Design a protein around this motif. Sequence first.
Motif, PDB file in Angstrom:
ATOM      1  N   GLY A   1       4.455  11.983  30.068  1.00 53.79           N
ATOM      2  CA  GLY A   1       5.858  11.864  29.870  1.00 53.79           C
ATOM      3  C   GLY A   1       6.494  11.303  31.095  1.00 53.79           C
TER       4      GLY A   1
ATOM      5  N   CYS B   1       1.598 -12.181   0.939  1.00 54.61           N
ATOM      6  CA  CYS B   1       2.690 -11.642   1.492  1.00 54.61           C
ATOM      7  C   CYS B   1       2.648 -10.449   2.522  1.00 54.61           C
ATOM      8  CB  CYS B   1       3.716 -11.315   0.105  1.00 54.61           C
ATOM      9  N   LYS B   2       1.675  -9.445   1.731  1.00 54.75           N
ATOM     10  CA  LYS B   2       1.421  -8.470   2.697  1.00 54.75           C
ATOM     11  C   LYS B   2       0.789  -8.806   4.024  1.00 54.75           C
TER      12      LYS B   2
ATOM     13  N   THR C   1       3.506 -10.510   6.318  1.00 54.57           N
ATOM     14  CA  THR C   1       4.257  -9.576   6.954  1.00 54.57           C
ATOM     15  C   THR C   1       3.513  -9.023   8.280  1.00 54.57           C
ATOM     16  N   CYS C   2       2.342  -8.626   8.153  1.00 51.08           N
ATOM     17  CA  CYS C   2       1.773  -8.201   9.208  1.00 51.08           C
ATOM     18  C   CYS C   2       1.326  -9.197  10.544  1.00 51.08           C
ATOM     19  CB  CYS C   2       0.277  -7.733   8.599  1.00 51.08           C
TER      20      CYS C   2
ATOM     21  N   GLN D   1       4.999  -9.144  12.435  1.00 48.95           N
ATOM     22  CA  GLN D   1       5.427  -7.850  13.322  1.00 48.95           C
ATOM     23  C   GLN D   1       4.307  -7.868  14.557  1.00 48.95           C
TER      24      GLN D   1
ATOM     25  N   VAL E   1      10.739  15.635  26.725  1.00 50.92           N
ATOM     26  CA  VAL E   1       9.282  15.300  26.937  1.00 50.92           C
ATOM     27  C   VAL E   1       9.132  13.685  26.592  1.00 50.92           C
TER      28      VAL E   1
ATOM     29  N   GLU F   1       6.315  -2.708  11.142  1.00 48.81           N
ATOM     30  CA  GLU F   1       5.447  -3.609  10.589  1.00 48.81           C
ATOM     31  C   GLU F   1       4.748  -2.540   9.644  1.00 48.81           C
TER      32      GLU F   1
ATOM     33  N   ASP G   1       4.624  -3.825   5.754  1.00 52.63           N
ATOM     34  CA  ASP G   1       3.112  -4.066   5.022  1.00 52.63           C
ATOM     35  C   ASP G   1       2.937  -3.218   3.956  1.00 52.63           C
TER      36      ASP G   1
ATOM     37  N   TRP H   1       5.602  -4.604   1.192  1.00 50.80           N
ATOM     38  CA  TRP H   1       5.704  -6.176   0.724  1.00 50.80           C
ATOM     39  C   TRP H   1       4.703  -6.904   1.180  1.00 50.80           C
TER      40      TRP H   1
ATOM     41  N   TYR I   1       2.498  12.482  25.226  1.00 50.68           N
ATOM     42  CA  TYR I   1       3.988  11.830  25.244  1.00 50.68           C
ATOM     43  C   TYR I   1       3.827  10.543  24.534  1.00 50.68           C
TER      44      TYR I   1
END
Lengths: 81, 119, 367
Positions: free
Chosen positions: A36, B53-54, B57-58, B61, C210, C221, C225, C228, C271
């Motif tokens: 943490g 498409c899938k 999009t991956c 990201q 915490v 994503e 994912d 779409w 954490y």
Amino acid sequence: VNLERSYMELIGAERETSRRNFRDLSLRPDVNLVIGGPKYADCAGGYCYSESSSLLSATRNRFLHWTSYADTLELVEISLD
Amino acid sequence: QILRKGSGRVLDLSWEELRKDVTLTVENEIQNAVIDYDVSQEEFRQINIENWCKFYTCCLQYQETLSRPLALLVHPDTNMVCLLRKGFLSFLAPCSLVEHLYLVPAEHLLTVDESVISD
Amino acid sequence: ETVNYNVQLFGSSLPVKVMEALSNASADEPMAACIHEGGWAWLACNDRLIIWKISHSSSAKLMVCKELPLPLSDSEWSADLVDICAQTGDPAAAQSVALMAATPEGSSRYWPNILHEGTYIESYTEFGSSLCAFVTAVKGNSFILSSEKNQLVRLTPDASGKMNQRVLPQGQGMESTLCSVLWDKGDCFYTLTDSSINKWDLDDTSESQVLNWDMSRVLREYISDAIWININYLSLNQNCDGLVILSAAWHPGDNPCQIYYTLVTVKDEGYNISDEITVEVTQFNPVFQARGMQLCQLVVPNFSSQACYLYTQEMIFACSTGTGRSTLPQEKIPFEAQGDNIVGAGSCEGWPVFFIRKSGMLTVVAR
């Protein structure tokens, strides 16, 4: 004074499919893992050698950069020559 | 690596190898989405689009995450300027005057020092 | 009927006061209800609070229903701002039960015992006008009042009649807009905001921060994912698989634009977030209308069957989480017909409980 007002970003494309064969080095200081702990944001920096502007210098167009994230520091030496 | 659901050691694949490797991986997902032997050509095309498409999009990201902004390096003696991004190094090079004028926002174009364009 | 479920009366005949409030209530009237895990139900109806023990037994000597007078407000009172505390956590009649209420502006009214309905103490916090807040019973006979801007305030009744208050560590509030809060087993209090999940570890008088996890960075994503992109995080619950997040996602430029509701399960271990995120896309897939009309809440009655119940005001969706291995059949259960409506939902003894405008408390049980 050529007032160079705007600059453009030029991507120094790392097109080496070799990931710069990062000499992975792990340092284990005698310290316990703090659960943490503060998440620092990712940061970077750089360093230029003395006499890097000198045409006869062995440091000519050489510099260092680094990225640091969490527990990791990536150090790189670049020469444009 | 994520689509494969698999812990395979990624070999330093050549880019051609990586392209073949993407193709085969998405084709296999399409073949798995075709449940019936009598799919119309339209329904097959729709399934092809949905699967690529899938995958796209991956990639997006991950590219967003690697593109995250670091800091600036300026050399005192050589005036070299570098933009340190999360995934790569960029260099800032001086823009030529023609490109400067075309690319500057319409609001800032009114404050250009006309003495630099021409005497 | 429904295909895979029995939807029927749960418990005995409702208290007379609850029946009058329902029979008198018009469809203009906003009723809200807090169905508490301790087996007590709290109906916020106009300017009174009607609180009764969920009567699993029909016997009249075990019957408890009390009616409390709310602190004056210009806004509607909410059963979200209303919470029960039990002596040692054990629900054992009217003396065991203490009560707090809050208003949207931050006026607090606390009854030490629901036995003594004229006996209360008062206090004030402070909020902006428009704040949707929650009040949540936590350990040590205390409460957390949570702002729309995610200012979290601990409220502790003292034996003097004072109410002690303090802000949570790193919980000053100041996009940190609040969607929901969760009070878990042991001492963990979580907040879900529009950008992140924060967690506190509590004792009887304090809290220790915490972590805060940028779940917008982590899950974006995996959500996009799996479908779409706009993503809104709406509710947070937990089960054995860990934390269960309800998320709505949509793309404006979709040729028909629908809203996809997802259940996202992640582990809370230490954490940091794990690499393992599951995204499960529900049957609930209405047309996009407006962002302010994206309303949907989450109930998880059974901690160990991977089953979740999405709800709005007109229907319940029995949904799955996780792998889907122990999940119940996916089905939409309608409560929209003939002025009927879902006023609230919860769990009693691990059973999914709905409080319905036409039929009162009802359970959803597999056939």
